Symmetry: C3
Subunit: 479 residues, 3 copies
């Protein structure tokens, strides 16, 4: 990966990050009370809010239920503890690898799950936003209720036949709002929805304001709850669910990471360059992975990026074409360019105190000393340090330079207009039909250059006939 040489067609390494992989996945358990608890006593009042919200979050979770059920019915992990073997995966119908992985993790968590739903009665009757779940002075985990705090702060100490409508109103408000938010993250599309991942998004919905407390509680680490809540390291799998109690057990995994050595992930941005009288930019991957002499396109989409680090749980590398590699590795005659409509924002960056600009599409005016800086055609973009200028101006934006670049250049860079391609499907599809046309010109041309041959070969046959007759009439002369 030759960066030095790549900066001479505007290709700027914005930041260099270290790649991360997971050694083991630290875990914790979570019970979600879907129904809030009442401490107030109810008399001569049928609170209609609840017999409905019950029915509906029950309907909403009926798939995840029947699936947790069908699977647990046909898991059967032989011995498990220690290392066992899962039996009868055909129960999943068709499944992907990530789905099968989760199918087995469901089976392991089975125990800790049942251990938790064992105590559903306690958990239900307990009134808290965030309670501990205890058995034998050990914690099986945390149980949460996203609205309880809010319920507590609003019901009458006593529900009477006077309070009825007014209570069943504002309970309904709170209930039906949380029910609307559950109706996003719980649409059922697929065949084994129990196995579906719970995003850090779906989690913020389920736990509500309880989330920060649970993150501080469920995991202990050098990681701050700040960066832990903010990134997307956290993930969950539904591992247990009782409908009648509306309690839903969720395994939550925080992966322990470590550097993968001799690998870097480098983001590439491109300023505009001036080459063969067009304003273009390099056509390269915006971020690649580099291990030794290997290079691939590394878009970290779902992945967790930080100033010095990328954690990809997954791996979505794309392969790089032969020119593209060549391009990245020094041979600039294989870099591919494309016309762009430059702009101030896209026509220069700033690198450790030095200016890499396209000083031709854009005006580079030096202040000390003041001389409009012209960019030669043998230079696609322009480097600017202390020597070329101690005080730059650019439009309204002005600054000084203390920085000096290590020479390390030695001109020049020759690139043919054939390195300037369409990158657009339509543009390309057009350039293709053109070549096809040209090729049909060369086909009709051949068929025509083959009628000439048939001619010429036939004129040679006449010359042979003439020659057989002369040479024979010479034999006729025997004297």
């Amino acid at each position: 990966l030759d960066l030095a040489a790549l900066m001479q067609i505007g290709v700027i390494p914005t930041n260099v990050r270290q790649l991360m992989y997971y050694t083991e996945a630290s875990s914790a358990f979570i019970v979600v009370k879907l129904m809030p608890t009442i401490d107030s006593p109810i008399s001569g009042c049928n609170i209609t809010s609840i017999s409905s919200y019950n029915a509906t979050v029950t309907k909403l979770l009926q798939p995840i239920g029947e699936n947790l059920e069908t699977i647990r019915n046909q898991l059967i992990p032989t011995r498990r503890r220690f290392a066992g073997v899962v039996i009868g995966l055909a129960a999943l119908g068709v499944a992907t690898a990530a789905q099968v992985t989760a199918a087995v993790a469901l089976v392991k968590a089975n125990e800790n799950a049942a251990a938790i739903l064992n105590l559903k009665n306690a958990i239900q009757k307990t009134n808290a936003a965030v309670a501990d779940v205890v058995q034998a002075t050990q914690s099986l985990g945390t149980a949460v209720q996203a609205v309880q705090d809010h319920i507590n702060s609003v019901v009458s100490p006593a529900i009477t036949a006077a309070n009825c409508k007014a209570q069943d109103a504002i309970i309904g408000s709170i209930l039906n709002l949380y029910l609307t938010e559950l109706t996003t993250i719980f649409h059922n599309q697929i065949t084994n929805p129990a196995l579906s991942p719970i995003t850090i998004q779906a989690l913020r919905i389920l736990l509500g304001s309880t989330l920060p407390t649970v993150v501080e509680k469920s995991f202990n680490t050098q990681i701050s709850a700040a960066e832990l809540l903010s990134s997307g390291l956290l993930t969950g799998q539904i591992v247990g669910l009782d409908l009648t109690y509306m309690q839903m057990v969720i395994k939550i995994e925080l992966p322990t990471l470590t550097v993968q050595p001799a690998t870097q992930i480098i983001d590439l941005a491109t300023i505009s360059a001036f080459i063969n009288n067009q304003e273009v930019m390099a056509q390269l991957p915006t971020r690649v992975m580099v291990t030794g002499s290997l290079i691939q396109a590394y878009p970290a989409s779902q992945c967790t990026i930080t100033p010095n680090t990328v954690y990809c749980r997954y791996n979505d590398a794309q392969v790089l074409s032969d020119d593209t590699m060549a391009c990245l590795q020094g041979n600039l005659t294989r870099c591919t360019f494309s016309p762009v409509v430059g702009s101030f924002l896209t026509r220069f960056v700033l690198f450790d105190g030095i200016v890499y600009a396209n000083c031709r599409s854009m005006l580079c005016k030096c202040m000390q000393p003041a001389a409009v800086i012209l960019q030669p055609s043998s230079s696609p973009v322009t480097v600017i340090d202390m020597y070329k200028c101690v005080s730059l101006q650019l439009d309204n934006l002005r600054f000084t330079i203390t920085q000096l670049a290590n020479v390390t250049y030695n001109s020049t860079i020759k690139l043919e207009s054939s390195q300037i391609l369409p990158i657009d499907p339509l543009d390309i599809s057009q350039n293709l039909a053109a070549v096809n046309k040209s090729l049909s010109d060369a086909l009709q041309h051949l068929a025509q250059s083959d009628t000439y041959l048939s001619a010429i070969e036939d004129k040679i046959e006449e010359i042979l006939s003439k020659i057989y007759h002369i040479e024979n009439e010479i034999a006729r002369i025997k004297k």
Copy 2:
């Protein structure tokens, strides 16, 4: 379609679904009072909240309002109805067919909107989050107020002039929130904003806590309320507005669906294959429609998906090349592929108990009877069933296999490297540049082959004069 064939190249049918079209909707009329009622008595103070709120909400609706007004005037103007034909669509300006359908729908509801809006004052001074609406035995619709119960549970049954500023500041903290939620869904960008459909996303902001209630009573249907709230089947269109009263009549529709016969919607996954010493993936549409001898690409990205069913009001079929068409219909030699960087997640898939995997790129370690499973280059993917393995170890995954695969075979498929194409545009472009260099070099070739053709016409002339002068010195010999 030949799903059997495709499997042998890593192409897996994940879902098969009925396709459902819409043969008529059921509708409900909601009215949204954006201004909640304040029953409690005042004393010598102005509630600044309701001031800036009346102002700011009213101005936000102005485009929707002015446009509602125009169309209603120019299409069917205080004439005696209707039904049948709509007049003067020129008022729309430039309209899409959806916008034209909306317009007819608006003037078709004109009367029922008018009916509900007669009672604007009864409604507006009624204190209910969810208010029924009836006209002397005639069910007209349903009034709703989004923040009603959250102001019911804060209002001090009397407002002094000393507790004024203090209760102003907390009505204008809730009013301002529900306001901020409104500034999102009500931009004005297009020419006829009153025709823009209301999405379920938008209905959730407008109706807030009231939505599941509305959904429950608005439609008498078999479909659950959990389904409706969570799906996408719900859509709305504004049919009436009154800025003074800040009420908005919204019509809400629920499509009645029927299964489209002899059609299925098929999802196709690709695991990676090993072909001509490469790891690749087949390049095909990930979801397709199939009916009779037909096959179209059907990415139902905006449609509603359940496990058996795909409802699509919007029919967006992509049409397929004859190459792809032949690939899916059986002829594997026409298929295309592209290089990929396999991961554990993409190298396999489990299919009714039977593993399909790239046992080249990935180690298929069979545990009992212990063996590395090898994958002959003849086979692009391996089919693991009871015979090849009984208990399989794919990294952390250990699991039995007890079934036998259907014997449609044999492994006699040969695949050209001319079948491994690029799909990234940048690559496809480079490849085109390379074909064009190659045509340009086959054009310099026929040029030179035309130069020889001229040079030989020269020689064979110069030969023809030699034979003359020769024939003549023969004639010249008379003795």
Copy 3:
């Protein structure tokens, strides 16, 4: 740009808009009181929610604070003679143009940021939702606090020991919810996270319910709050921060838009046309920018759009191919078409009263005069005006057309103009052409052979002559 020719193949200009260029900004200052003030007396009770909130939030801001101070220490404007010339930019490291713009912005607002931050003690002790910030009878900015009101509505008049539990509960439940939101908009992936623009989405979260009120307070203009809040005009930058007090200074900017002359942003949509037994669709930019003789693709994706006007901070202009430029300018034989499975939805539009449709694909049933409209092969689309049909029916729709043609204008289009645009079908084609180039290469290499032979024949000639030149030479006597 021949729009009227374009319409003949179903290319419809559905919007015509002005374009606005950024001129100046209107700067306003905000201070987010992150920590709400609590007037209730506490007695023998450690409200734990505060200290967790206080800590968790302080950690969350570590990057922005550091990167704030790092730049303030290193940058310094401070010029001399006589412009806004700046020193020491190597503190930003590798940073893009737009962020260097943000850094000089950051370094101008020093004096005013530090002036506001001098009043920090006063601000933190003032229990107010929205609240002005003054020094020497001068309004410097507004001091907001997203939860102050909700707090006040629920915290008990005096916090006792029989109180603590329900009280620490309800207060954490406010503090945490707001804290959770804080984490969706604060996450450093990048080098200098203090120059990261603050979206309108961020403000709605960062200021909560104070946002409407604080927007009318800070901006004198003819754009109302409705417009101001509904659009993407509102941008913010972080210009200061005190971690001890949990107060963050934010500079809102509201642009000043002036019309760009001779420039227009036209939206092109496409109905489906019938061309050579094929249902197809012109392949054009959905959106373009036209200054007289010039045409660029202008799909304004991150720009504010009103029915008459379009504003962008910078440009998303892309350069058009020559064929499409030719197609846009009236040469219909330079157009590119691809096949589609059109719907009722893409088979017609309405243009100021007149119906432009595909009466081949879709049934254009005419209710008066009661006949079916058939579309000729010469015609890609049909133009139905009042003369064609006064009363139309398209599926379930029935309407009238009373407006009149304005004919003005036929065009012949080659099946070759139909191409794929989906990178796969293109790639399969590029292969099929390479396979043909191989036929031409073999045909060249094979005629290469009929040329070395046939040059063997002339060498036979040359010799067979030389030998009848031996005779005829020795036949001299």
